[PDB]
Design an enzyme around this catalytic site. Sequence first.
Site, PDB file in Angstrom:
ATOM      1  N   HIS B 159      33.852  -1.345  -3.435  1.00  0.00           N
ATOM      2  CA  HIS B 159      32.857  -1.442  -3.837  1.00  0.00           C
ATOM      3  C   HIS B 159      32.825  -1.775  -4.759  1.00  0.00           C
ATOM      4  O   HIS B 159      31.611  -2.095  -5.476  1.00  0.00           O
ATOM      5  CB  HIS B 159      32.245   0.086  -3.272  1.00  0.00           C
ATOM      6  N   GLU B 168      35.132   6.070  -3.461  1.00  0.00           N
ATOM      7  CA  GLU B 168      33.641   7.282  -3.683  1.00  0.00           C
ATOM      8  C   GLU B 168      34.206   8.519  -4.168  1.00  0.00           C
ATOM      9  O   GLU B 168      34.814   8.986  -4.049  1.00  0.00           O
ATOM     10  CB  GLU B 168      32.890   7.239  -2.588  1.00  0.00           C
ATOM     11  N   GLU B 211      27.121   0.398  -4.510  1.00  0.00           N
ATOM     12  CA  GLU B 211      26.666   1.507  -4.848  1.00  0.00           C
ATOM     13  C   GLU B 211      26.121   2.681  -6.566  1.00  0.00           C
ATOM     14  O   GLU B 211      25.558   3.730  -6.478  1.00  0.00           O
ATOM     15  CB  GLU B 211      27.719   2.693  -4.660  1.00  0.00           C
ATOM     16  N   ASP B 246      35.044  10.270  -0.880  1.00  0.00           N
ATOM     17  CA  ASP B 246      34.672   9.441   0.332  1.00  0.00           C
ATOM     18  C   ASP B 246      36.254   8.413  -0.143  1.00  0.00           C
ATOM     19  O   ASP B 246      36.949   7.407  -0.678  1.00  0.00           O
ATOM     20  CB  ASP B 246      34.161   7.903   0.441  1.00  0.00           C
ATOM     21  N   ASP B 320      33.973   9.461   9.650  1.00  0.00           N
ATOM     22  CA  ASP B 320      33.409   8.627   9.284  1.00  0.00           C
ATOM     23  C   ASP B 320      32.886   7.347   9.794  1.00  0.00           C
ATOM     24  O   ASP B 320      32.918   7.166  11.046  1.00  0.00           O
ATOM     25  CB  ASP B 320      33.038   7.861   7.390  1.00  0.00           C
ATOM     26  N   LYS B 345      25.078   8.018  10.225  1.00  0.00           N
ATOM     27  CA  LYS B 345      24.811   6.261   9.999  1.00  0.00           C
ATOM     28  C   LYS B 345      24.256   5.873  11.047  1.00  0.00           C
ATOM     29  O   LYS B 345      24.898   5.550  12.370  1.00  0.00           O
ATOM     30  CB  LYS B 345      25.835   6.074   9.480  1.00  0.00           C
ATOM     31  N   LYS B 396      24.151  11.491   1.447  1.00  0.00           N
ATOM     32  CA  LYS B 396      24.481  10.829   0.500  1.00  0.00           C
ATOM     33  C   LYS B 396      23.656   9.418   0.913  1.00  0.00           C
ATOM     34  O   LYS B 396      24.052   8.893   1.689  1.00  0.00           O
ATOM     35  CB  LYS B 396      26.359  10.381   0.750  1.00  0.00           C
TER      36      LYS B 396
HETATM   37 MG   LIG Z   1      33.077   2.264   5.157  1.00  0.00          MG
HETATM   38 MG   LIG Z   2      32.849   6.016   3.952  1.00  0.00          MG
END
Ligand SMILES: [Mg+2]
Ligand SMILES: [Mg+2]
Lengths: 436, 436
Positions: B159, B168, B211, B246, B320, B345, B396
């Site tokens: 990111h 994260e 982000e 994360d 995830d 998601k 989140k």
């Molecule tokens: Mg990802």
């Molecule tokens: Mg993730």
Amino acid sequence: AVSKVYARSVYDSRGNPTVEVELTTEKGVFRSIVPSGASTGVHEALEMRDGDKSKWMGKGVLHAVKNVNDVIAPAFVKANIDVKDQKAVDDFLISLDGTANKSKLGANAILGVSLAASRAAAAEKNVPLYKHLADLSKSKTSPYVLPVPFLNVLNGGSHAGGALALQEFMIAPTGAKTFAEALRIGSEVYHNLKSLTKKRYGASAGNVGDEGGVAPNIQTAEEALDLIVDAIKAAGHDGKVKIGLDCASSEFFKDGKYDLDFKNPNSDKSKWLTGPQLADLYHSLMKRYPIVSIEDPFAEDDWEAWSHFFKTAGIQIVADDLTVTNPKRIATAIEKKAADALLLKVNQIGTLSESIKAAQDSFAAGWGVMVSHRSGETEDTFIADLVVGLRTGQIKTGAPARSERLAKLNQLLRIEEELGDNAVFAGENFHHGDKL
Amino acid sequence: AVSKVYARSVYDSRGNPTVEVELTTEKGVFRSIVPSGASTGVHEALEMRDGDKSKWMGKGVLHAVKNVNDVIAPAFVKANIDVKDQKAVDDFLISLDGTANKSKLGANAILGVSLAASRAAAAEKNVPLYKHLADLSKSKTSPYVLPVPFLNVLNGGSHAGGALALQEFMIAPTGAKTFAEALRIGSEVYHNLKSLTKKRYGASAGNVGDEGGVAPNIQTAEEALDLIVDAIKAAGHDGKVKIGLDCASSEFFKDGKYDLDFKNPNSDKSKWLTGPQLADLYHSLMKRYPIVSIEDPFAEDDWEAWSHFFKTAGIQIVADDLTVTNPKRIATAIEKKAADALLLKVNQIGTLSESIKAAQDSFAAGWGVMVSHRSGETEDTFIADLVVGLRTGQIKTGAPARSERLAKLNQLLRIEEELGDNAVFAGENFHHGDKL
Ligand SMILES: [Mg+2]
Ligand SMILES: [Mg+2]
Ligand SMILES: [Mg+2]
Ligand SMILES: [Mg+2]
């Protein structure tokens, strides 16, 4: 018929509280969010903050919010005003504050109501916002004009950490044939720019500024510009994209001199530049790079400097902090032949009506008009409809990154599509879009 | 009665194109915009891109758009489906694609229609989105539960530019009494962090990642956590704020090992760690910091490493990339006891219906559900109403910077206000918010 007016505190693109207003009518609920600058000119209308260090770092807007709910609302509703009559609405609001710089209730308290009213009015007329806007401003609507977007792909000055003095480095795809194409070419250059940047100055240099541009830690305008021209070239758009700058010189003006290393607390006074010196610098960049527009080359009250450069410039010269979207300031600017384009910021003046007048005055003087967002934006897309309503042919609402920017760009895509054959893209005639 | 189904290409928060869908009913136009991930799992439903390198660097979505306009549209309209029956809508779309992973039409083409349909339904039933949602999922609505926000204030991995491998570093204000209070403290922390970062690592270090988080060029997690803890304290919130992570380990899993310096083309192979080794590191951090949640600590298919860790975790462990909002995959994880929380998601699965099922199966197994955005977001706020409708108690959606993030947060403030006394803030009980 307004049955209700209510405000709340929300967060801007920088995570700072801002004012959001809701207006209720038979037609529904209308909303509007107020933006907020960082390099705010001294002469801008008052933006009211709570100042309480124990909350939002003393940047809360409960007071402003209170003014809307406790003061503005009651009366407004009582007054029974025709929302379709923007002037009326604004007159009421201005009358209610009574000060010249809206120091009583605060511009952020007033603006929201003003903007929400125009939305409610458009609903009433059963027309799109940009249309009502064209009505309010008496702009020609045959056809409509899609503006050229000035994308700030490289951030400096106060918008990002680094040594770069100049604030914004933008690209303008004046060579596109439509708005959609322009934005496509714009993002293409942008992606290439990020790559190059990382490549030439390290991965971190690709991280972004407040307005979404890359923020490399460089010290000269030349280094920033070299990257941009190389990006345009690598993307394959050479000749279709031009450059515009936002110097935000007031940010570094000190003691009648300009400090290009102002972000360095131990800056060298001997290096500070004089008006004329700075003008020589600008000229050097102009001759070398395809710059077609400069904003705030000189400080907010350095009249003589602007007038002097103006006569040799030969390109679009935009007034931002100098004019503050204020009809009175513009009159002077116009008299002194200091600039030839106005940077329109609803929040610099405080009311829609006043902003529309600013535009009309500029156009009357043969000036150009560039609609703009503020460095602290929101999900609100008002300015998109505005630039189309006013037919300016040019807008500045950020780099093609960070949703507070894309929201407006996306909005412009939706309008262009809606208008179909009833619109033309400003292209190379962006300076005088209004006369197209 | 659906009269029209239409789609267009718009831009995400990184400047990349994406799908925007518009559904037209007797009640008006309903819109939906699809987000796009960067560190996407191999098991995610198919995101369809054009691959025409001459346009948008191959990231166009003309094909997906055409799929909606020319394929889904006519058959959907002619089908006369009742938007109120989400299941029937979704079933219709799935059957139309006919692939295991929506590889024929693209999940990006499908999701837009699925989500847009739910908005239209809510209008028809004259209710707020979150209510319709709570309806679709048979959630308990008395009271509603407001989630704790996981704010990703420090960015790494893919990111942001820099050496930091873990993706994260999030804060969670569990010690707040209201969501409004949650966000307030979260931003204050955030502002403190940015200041401290710049002081400790330099100006450029304050620039941000995809982000909204600051992106210091650091190499260890400890450096990151130390920044954060100091920030919490400095802002005066010691005790009310917890930490979440994360790891997005799949991105640095190679040859059965984990490379904590994967961004370095000259990463040291001797330095790569084994699962158990990595687990050691974790336990080390959990011991020294108020960490309450770990996401994707192990690779997408490294089942045994997960199972192993889970045994002595003692904290929330979120899946995830391992589960990809897929029931079939969820079944597996529950059975092998790999994690105790699902990362939801809609775009990993493709339809609202399937995503709901996923949440249900999770809650049923005694797991928690963290509703999530993607790194490539838009002005769409669907997930705000979604977390509330599902009553998960945790979401989140980024740092409190960058409107693609704030738009969701602002939206939650709005809902909070509206619900009033008929809703509680999850606080310290985020894990089982659904059981509140
Ligand atoms: Mg990802
Ligand atoms: Mg993730
Ligand atoms: Mg400024
Ligand atoms: Mg400016």
